[PDB]
Amino acid sequence: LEKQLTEEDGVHSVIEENIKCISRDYVLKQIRSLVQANPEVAMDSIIHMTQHISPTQRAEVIRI
Amino acid sequence: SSVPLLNSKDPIDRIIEFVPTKTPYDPRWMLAGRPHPTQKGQWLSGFFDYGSFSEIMQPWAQTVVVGRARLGGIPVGVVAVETRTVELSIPADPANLDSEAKIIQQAGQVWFPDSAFKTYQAIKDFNREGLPLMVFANWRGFSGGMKDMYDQVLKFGAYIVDGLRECCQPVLVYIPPQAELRGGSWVVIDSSINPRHMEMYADRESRGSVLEPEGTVEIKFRRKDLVKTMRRVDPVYIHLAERLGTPELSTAERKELENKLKEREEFLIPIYHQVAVQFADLHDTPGRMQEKGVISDILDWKTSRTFFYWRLRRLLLEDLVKKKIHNANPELTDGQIQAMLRRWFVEVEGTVKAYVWDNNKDLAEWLEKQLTEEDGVHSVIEENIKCISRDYVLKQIRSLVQANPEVAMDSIIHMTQHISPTQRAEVIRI
Amino acid sequence: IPVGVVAVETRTVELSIPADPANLDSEAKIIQQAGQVWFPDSAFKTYQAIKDFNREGLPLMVFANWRGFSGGM
Amino acid sequence: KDLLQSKRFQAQSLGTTYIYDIPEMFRQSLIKLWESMSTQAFLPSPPLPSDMLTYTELVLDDQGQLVHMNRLPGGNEIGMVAWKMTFKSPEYPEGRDIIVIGNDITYRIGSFGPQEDLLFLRASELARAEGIPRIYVSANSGARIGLAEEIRHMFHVAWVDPEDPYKGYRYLYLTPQDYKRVSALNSVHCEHVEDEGESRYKITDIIGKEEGIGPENLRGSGMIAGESSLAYNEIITISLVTCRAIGIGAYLVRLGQRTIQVENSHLILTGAGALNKVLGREVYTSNNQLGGIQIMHNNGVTHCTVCDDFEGVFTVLHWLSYMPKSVH
Numbered sequence: 001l002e003k004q005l006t007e008e009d010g011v012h013s014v015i016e017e018n019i020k021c022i023s024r025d026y027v028l029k030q031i032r033s034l035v036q037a038n039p040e041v042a043m044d045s046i047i048h049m050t051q052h053i054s055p056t057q058r059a060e061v062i063r064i
Numbered sequence: 065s066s067v068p069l070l071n072s073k074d075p076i077d078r079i080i081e082f083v084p085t086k087t088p089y090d091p092r093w094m095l096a097g098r099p100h101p102t103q104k105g106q107w108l109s110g111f112f113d114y115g116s117f118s119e120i121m122q123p124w125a126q127t128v129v130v131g132r133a134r135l136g137g138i139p140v141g142v143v144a145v146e147t148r149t150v151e152l153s154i155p156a157d158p159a160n161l162d163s164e165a166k167i168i169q170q171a172g173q174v175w176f177p178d179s180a181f182k183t184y185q186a187i188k189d190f191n192r193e194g195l196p197l198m199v200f201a202n203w204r205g206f207s208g209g210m211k212d213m214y215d216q217v218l219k220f221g222a223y224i225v226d227g228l229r230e231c232c233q234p235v236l237v238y239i240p241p242q243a244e245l246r247g248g249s250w251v252v253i254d255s256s257i258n259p260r261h262m263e264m265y266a267d268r269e270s271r272g273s274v275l276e277p278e279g280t281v282e283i284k285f286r287r288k289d290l291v292k293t294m295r296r297v298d299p300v301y302i303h304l305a306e307r308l309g310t311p312e313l314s315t316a317e318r319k320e321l322e323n324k325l326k327e328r329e330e331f332l333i334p335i336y337h338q339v340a341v342q343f344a345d346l347h348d349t350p351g352r353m354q355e356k357g358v359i360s361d362i363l364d365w366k367t368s369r370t371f372f373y374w375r376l377r378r379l380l381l382e383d384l385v386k387k388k389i390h391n392a393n394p395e396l397t398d399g400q401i402q403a404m405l406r407r408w409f410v411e412v413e414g415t416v417k418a419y420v421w422d423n424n425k426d427l428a429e430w431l432e433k434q435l436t437e438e439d440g441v442h443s444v445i446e447e448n449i450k451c452i453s454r455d456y457v458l459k460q461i462r463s464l465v466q467a468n469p470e471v472a473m474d475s476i477i478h479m480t481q482h483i484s485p486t487q488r489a490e491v492i493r494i
Numbered sequence: 495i496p497v498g499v500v501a502v503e504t505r506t507v508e509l510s511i512p513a514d515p516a517n518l519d520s521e522a523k524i525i526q527q528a529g530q531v532w533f534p535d536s537a538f539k540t541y542q543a544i545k546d547f548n549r550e551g552l553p554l555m556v557f558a559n560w561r562g563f564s565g566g567m
Numbered sequence: 568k569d570l571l572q573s574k575r576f577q578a579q580s581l582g583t584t585y586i587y588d589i590p591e592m593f594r595q596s597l598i599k600l601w602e603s604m605s606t607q608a609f610l611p612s613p614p615l616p617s618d619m620l621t622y623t624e625l626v627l628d629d630q631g632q633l634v635h636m637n638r639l640p641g642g643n644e645i646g647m648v649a650w651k652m653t654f655k656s657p658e659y660p661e662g663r664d665i666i667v668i669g670n671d672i673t674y675r676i677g678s679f680g681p682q683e684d685l686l687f688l689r690a691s692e693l694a695r696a697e698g699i700p701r702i703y704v705s706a707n708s709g710a711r712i713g714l715a716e717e718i719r720h721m722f723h724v725a726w727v728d729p730e731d732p733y734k735g736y737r738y739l740y741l742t743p744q745d746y747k748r749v750s751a752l753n754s755v756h757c758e759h760v761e762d763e764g765e766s767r768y769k770i771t772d773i774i775g776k777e778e779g780i781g782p783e784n785l786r787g788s789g790m791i792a793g794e795s796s797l798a799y800n801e802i803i804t805i806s807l808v809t810c811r812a813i814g815i816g817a818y819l820v821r822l823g824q825r826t827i828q829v830e831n832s833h834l835i836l837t838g839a840g841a842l843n844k845v846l847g848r849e850v851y852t853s854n855n856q857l858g859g860i861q862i863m864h865n866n867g868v869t870h871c872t873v874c875d876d877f878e879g880v881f882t883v884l885h886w887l888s889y890m891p892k893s894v895h
């Protein structure tokens with residue numbers, strides 16, 4: 001545990017990456033959970049999330 | 065759920081008949097009442113609905129009284145203070161053949177370790193039941209003798225604060241007539257410990273200060289200040305002092321005048337001491353507390369129920385709508401919520417009616433109409449709450465992704481699966 | 495590693511209760527307190543230490559040699 | 568002298584130090600700590616004393632907010648002084664922060680005013696926002712009391728018998744000549760009466776033009792009491808009793824729950840004189856009988872006893888040696 005928590009710029013702490021993964025998954029689940037329970041805001045959350053994406057992501061948004 | 069309400073048989077527009085006196089009294093006489101002293105029947109009303117007061121922990125720590133009761137059908141927890149002298153009997157332990165049973169004299173209007181502990185327990189229990197708390201405060205302070213400091217009075221004095229700070233229901237402190245709060249008894253039940261819920265009220269025949277008048281005299285009116293006061297009041301002293309200070313009289317005359325002045329200075333002490341005590345008492349009045357802003361209002365005892373009903377009801381109704389607001393946007397603080405409710409009221413009723421806020425009855429009726437009426441006027445306050453909820457949810461979505469753009473492309477797609485074709489056109493075109 | 499410590503005394507101890515000068519007929523007393531028994535003062539002391547060391551943020555090492563609580567009158 | 572070598576003497580006459588010596592003792596105690604623990608760990612080389620402690624005084628601005636001021640000592644206009652101290656200690660070689668709060672026993676002796684209470688509250692709020700310990704050095708004489716001095720100088724008594732004052736008096740009053748020049752300040756409320764053909768203003772409520780002597784000190788005291796009750800549940804709270812503590816000053820100490828008490832001090836709620844007056848005889852001869860170490864140390868209000876203030880500051884640092892720099 002010490003090697004995994006205190007070491008940086010080294011083996012890079014694989015458990016740190018696992019924690020980041022759990023975090024991102026939680027954030028995504030919360031976004032979808034909040035809008036699913038209140039659909040009335042969905043069209044407003046879409047637009048804001050198209051303002052800071054690359055053109056290929058925008059093409060994915062339009063095509064899919 | 066909220067606290068249950070009864071359609072009581074005891075009116076709200078009556079007055080309290082029993083009046084707290086300067087001599088010792090049983091505090092229950094002001095909560096529940098007492099039979100008429102001159103009649104065989106005939107009940108003298110108290111503060112609460114007749115038959116409603118119920119005690120707990122009676123024979124323990126008898127200098128403080130606690131219970132449950134009802135005000136206009138609204139259940140409340142009750143704390144009050146004994147003014148009579150009580151006798152505490154301590155039994156002997158048979159394990160020690162040389163032990164003896166003892167009687168300890170406990171004076172009223174004073175905290176002891178046991179009475180402070182009981183007050184703390186009552187506060188915690190009543191808060192956890194979900195009830196508002198009515199406190200009738202007549203504490204002159206804490207016992208400071210060797211025994212009570214040894215028996216750890218400071219600890220339970222502090223536990224009182226720890227308890228009140230955590231109350232989530234209304235806490236209405238009232239200083240009855242012929243009652244006082246002095247110093248150490250303020251700092252443990254002051255409204256600034258929990259401003260969101262605690263409110264303090266005083267009667268006209270009540271008192272509040274740091275020290276009693278006698279203790280203040282003992283510091284600020286020494287012998288020399290009493291003599292300085294005598295210098296401008298007493299005709300005999302004035303005559304003698306003006307004569308002694310007159311130059312070119314004689315030695316013997318000066319000696320006689322000085323001795324007469326000493327005699328008058330010592331002779332007049334009791335009367336000017338009483339004067340000093342009255343002067344000190346003149347600055348312990350509730351008008352000063354109202355001007356300084358340490359009480360919410362000055363109440364007449366006789367009508368106090370009618371005040372405290374309509375206040376309490378309003379607060380309870382506010383506690384509902386504020387809670388809903390807190391559920392719509394949990395990031396708001398309490399002042400924001402109070403101002404929001406103010407603004408909503410004025411916006412929907414009109415500015416000419418803006419003065420109808422500091423009016424407990426009219427606003428309680430308005431809040432009841434807005435919260436309890438359905439399939440009717442449709443509760444414009446409810447629609448405002450819905451709008452606040454919607455804005456909060458939208459802000460939370462944008463806040464969550466703005467901190468974490470790496471999920472944005474996954475959140476867009478899901479939100480295009482449950483929209484109309486025109487909304488999809490808007491998404492693509494914009 | 496900083497820790498909180500609670501331990502139990504096994505010897506018999508003597509509690510001296512002083513007299514209140516306000517009562518002319520009071521007397522100072524000696525109470526014998528046996529080891530390996532809880533008393534209200536010691537239970538309160540243990541509670542206070544637990545609350546304090548928790549609020550400091552420290553782990554707690556307890557060395558328990560308690561035969562029970564005193565049940566006398 | 569005019570300050571700083573006249574207040575030190577007054578503080579020393581009471582058995583305590585002057586408040587602005589708390590930092591110097593603090594630095595010296597840190598030195599002892601670095602040595603005392605040197606037998607318990609392979610500690611790195613200590614810092615120079617000049618780099619062992621750096622601190623800024625917290626003062627109130629005109630609005631009620633804190634200012635991190637660097638100023639010469641003795642410039643305090645109120646009876647409360649507080650600091651933010653950063654230092655290095657053996658367990659924390661680089662960084663350790665505290666908020667220190669103290670009474671000035673020589674400004675209007677001890678007693679808490681509205682500005683002292685406000686500074687206490689703001690310094691404690693800073694400690695909680697930062698999550699760092701709070702240290703309180705108590706040498707006070709309770710809340711602040713007072714009279715309306717002008718009225719005390721310009722009142723008259725309405726006697727039952729002006730030739731015999733032992734037949735009693737009816738009321739206290741002002742004359743119009745003196746009433747007209749005070750009542751505009753909301754210092755006194757009086758009701759006009761006619762008595763013996765004379766116009767008198769009978770005094771019914773005295774308010775006082777001076778701030779810091781009325782019920783506003785209770786509002787302050789209870790306010791800070793709540794703060795202490797909160798601070799115990801968020802941060803580390805330690806209290807040192809150097810001279811004495813009366814009333815709120817004792818509850819604050821008790822609300823810290825970690826009390827270090829110097830010998831020949833007392834934590835009281837009521838003085839010996841008042842108790843002897845109520846009881847009718849000289850029951851008690853000293854306040855140390857009421858809240859002294861023979862009482863406080865044996866009933867568990869006091870966690871530790873020490874001989875002088877320097878050992879007290881050492882004991883503070885010793886206890887802090889065991890605990891985290893912050894709640895996080």
Ligand SMILES: CC(=O)SCCNC(=O)CCNC(=O)[C@H](O)C(C)(C)COP(=O)(O)OP(=O)(O)OC[C@H]1O[C@@H](n2cnc3c(N)ncnc32)[C@H](O)[C@@H]1OP(=O)(O)O
Nearest residue numbers: 247248274283676678708709710711712813814815816838
């Ligand atoms: C905190 C609460 O909740 S209420 C508790 C309030 N605190 C008190 O009860 C005050 C206690 N009264 C006392 O005076 C204390 O017994 C002691 C220890 C200060 C007495 O010490 P003494 O050596 O007698 O001091 P002394 O009485 O000379 O007071 C010095 C002066 O400061 C003033 N003073 C003293 N104590 C206080 C106080 N607590 N508040 C305001 N002014 C005070 C007095 O006017 C006195 O007048 P002087 O300048 O003519 O002497």
